[PDB]
Structure 1
Amino acid sequence: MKLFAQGTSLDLSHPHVMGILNVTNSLIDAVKHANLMINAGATIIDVGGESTRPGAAEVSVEEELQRVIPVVEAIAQRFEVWISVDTSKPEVIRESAKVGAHIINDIRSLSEPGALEAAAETGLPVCLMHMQGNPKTMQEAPKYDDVFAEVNRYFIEQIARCEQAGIAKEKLLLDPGFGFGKNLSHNYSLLARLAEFHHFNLPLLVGMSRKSMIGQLLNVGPSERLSGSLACAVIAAMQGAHIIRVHDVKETVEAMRVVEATLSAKENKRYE
């Protein structure tokens, strides 16, 4: 299993760690943070300029472009690392790809007018994430009769939508969207059944780092979540998740080495 972008490839025969670069002197600091994450073993850096948090306010196209594009450009011309861009906006998609981004990682799964066409036009890999509702209301009262089945159905529908628009399946990644319109019990159901999403034969991307599913379980603040975060990452990686999106790159990469050593000693290379 392999992705292709910007003349290079990413080998997903083992887990990859994706370092979070939140850009909600800004430029110099962001590039220093990327550099530390690459040194710590991150092979993808995820650049995001619009808060995707519960209650988040929208940012203008011009402001997002100012936050994001100079960060993507600077990273693409200094390091060899892959770059994902965390955006919903057709223009940010286009401009990001122009300055070297490798993956479009939209929490809205290209739902914004023109996003689907912009993504297709780039030829880049696209991550389809499940979210119930939108960031302003998703956490008010998340509700499912069957969260796994409903996220599974969403991925069937969005894969088709993307194929229809000329995005080949081989470009797609799937992410169940931990914390995006889910209560604590919904999140743990998806984590527990994560391996079952492999039936699509597509890369799985997960992001649990420092999230509420750890916070509300342990009743701790956001700086006390490293152990819980590593536990989530290891649980996901043991079930064959391909990309783990995190704040704490060094510790995660170390945990992924242990997983890799364990999976390579196993006959069928996956827990289920």
Structure 2
Amino acid sequence: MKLFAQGTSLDLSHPHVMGILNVTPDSFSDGGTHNSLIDAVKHANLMINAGATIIDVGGESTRPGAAEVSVEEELQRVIPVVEAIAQRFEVWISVDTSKPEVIRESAKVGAHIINDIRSLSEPGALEAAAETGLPVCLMHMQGNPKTMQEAPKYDDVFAEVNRYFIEQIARCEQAGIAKEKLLLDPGFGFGKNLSHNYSLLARLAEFHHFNLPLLVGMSRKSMIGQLLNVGPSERLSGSLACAVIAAMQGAHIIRVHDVKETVEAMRVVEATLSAKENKRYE
């Protein structure tokens, strides 16, 4: 499968490692852009050289209890960074933003994929996304992403994620976005407890029936911290194990913090699927 955006293509024949670049008010320091723009570009550079092919630029934290960011705060931080990256490098760039104006402006400076945690649910976001013509990633979640309150109960979490994606592909089609520009994300860690998360990971090979690319982001999350009982920085081994289980089942983009190590794990996976009579574990 190939994605086309901004006069380029991304070939999803082999797994892609997507780096994380968050430029929130609390990390893209001291007011609305300091010299944190060369930090962001240094950081971009390291990830590309460690082998990342996509970079996910977001201006709003998605963690429990995270602050809301205003449109100006996001325009101020995200658009500088997306622009400077696209000028200097070959990488594909996706933007995680929920706001229509940030979608429109990030298209204008060279963003390739709109990767919104809220799946374009805000007023005018679908419309803006559609207008840009860019690839959009749809993500399951139940509730508000940044709540600090307990995980849903589901009749069946796999059945519910699957029926959510059928509903969102339709909505997007009704707004003129072709199915061919969609990517799907089960949304690990968002509205799911530890059991729900491993159920979705165990059955990731089943979401290929949509015949859409799968983007996955399990890096350093609670499904790893709770299972092993370790804090956020001692989660590498467990994050690499989730990355490999996902790629063995055919996930096309893996969103991680440790780019070097995951690229190395992905090489072993590729060498292995290359030798497999059907390029996927089921």
Q: 1:138 to 1:268 in 2, by over 3 A?
A: farther
In the alignment, the residues of structure 2 paired with residue 206 and residue 155 of structure 1 have an alpha-carbon distance, to the nearest angstrom, of 15
Give yes or no for contact 1:138–1:180 (8 Å, CA) kept in 2. no
Give the Å deviation of 1:143: 1.6
Q: 3-state SS of the aligned residue for 1:3?
A: strand
Match of 1:247 in 2: 257
Give the Å deviation of 1:140: 2.0
Paired-residue identity, %: 100
Residues paired across the two proteins, number: 271
Give the Å deviation of 1:139: 4.4
Q: 3-state SS of the aligned residue for 1:216?
A: helix
Give the Å deviation of 1:138: 6.7
Give yes or no for contact 1:179–1:211 (8 Å, CA) kept in 2. yes
In the alignment, the residues of structure 1 paired with residue 79 and residue 146 of structure 2 have an alpha-carbon distance, to the nearest angstrom, of 25
* Range with bigger deviation, 171-180 or 51-60: 51-60
Moved segments of 4+, more than 3 Å: none
Give the Å deviation of 1:186: 0.6
Give yes or no for contact 1:214–1:229 (8 Å, CA) kept in 2. yes
Give yes or no for contact 1:129–1:175 (8 Å, CA) kept in 2. yes
Q: TM-score, normalised by structure 1?
A: 0.98
Match of 1:15 in 2: 15
In the alignment, the residues of structure 1 paired with residue 148 and residue 166 of structure 2 have an alpha-carbon distance, to the nearest angstrom, of 21
In the alignment, the residues of structure 2 paired with residue 126 and residue 139 of structure 1 have an alpha-carbon distance, to the nearest angstrom, of 28
In the alignment, the residues of structure 1 paired with residue 91 and residue 226 of structure 2 have an alpha-carbon distance, to the nearest angstrom, of 34
Give the Å deviation of 1:56: 1.6
In the alignment, the residues of structure 1 paired with residue 191 and residue 242 of structure 2 have an alpha-carbon distance, to the nearest angstrom, of 18
Residues 169-197 of structure 1 deviation map (CA, whole Å, 9 limit, x = unaligned): 11000000000111100100000000100
- Tell me which of 79, 97, 102 is aligned to 1:92: 102
Give yes or no for contact 1:132–1:138 (8 Å, CA) kept in 2. no
Give the Å deviation of 1:136: 3.7
Q: TM-score, normalised by structure 2?
A: 0.95
Superposition CA RMSD, Å: 0.8
Gap runs ≥5 in structure 2: 24-34
Match of 1:39 in 2: 49
Q: 3-state SS of the aligned residue for 1:59?
A: coil
Give yes or no for contact 1:20–1:247 (8 Å, CA) kept in 2. yes
Give yes or no for contact 1:139–1:183 (8 Å, CA) kept in 2. no
In the alignment, the residues of structure 2 paired with residue 180 and residue 136 of structure 1 have an alpha-carbon distance, to the nearest angstrom, of 9
Give the Å deviation of 1:137: 2.8
Give the Å deviation of 1:145: 1.0
Give the Å deviation of 1:117: 0.4
In the alignment, the residues of structure 2 paired with residue 251 and residue 236 of structure 1 have an alpha-carbon distance, to the nearest angstrom, of 15
* Range with bigger deviation, 139-148 or 45-54: 139-148
Residues 35-54 of structure 1 deviation map (CA, whole Å, 9 limit, x = unaligned): 00000000000001001111
Gap runs ≥5 in structure 1: none
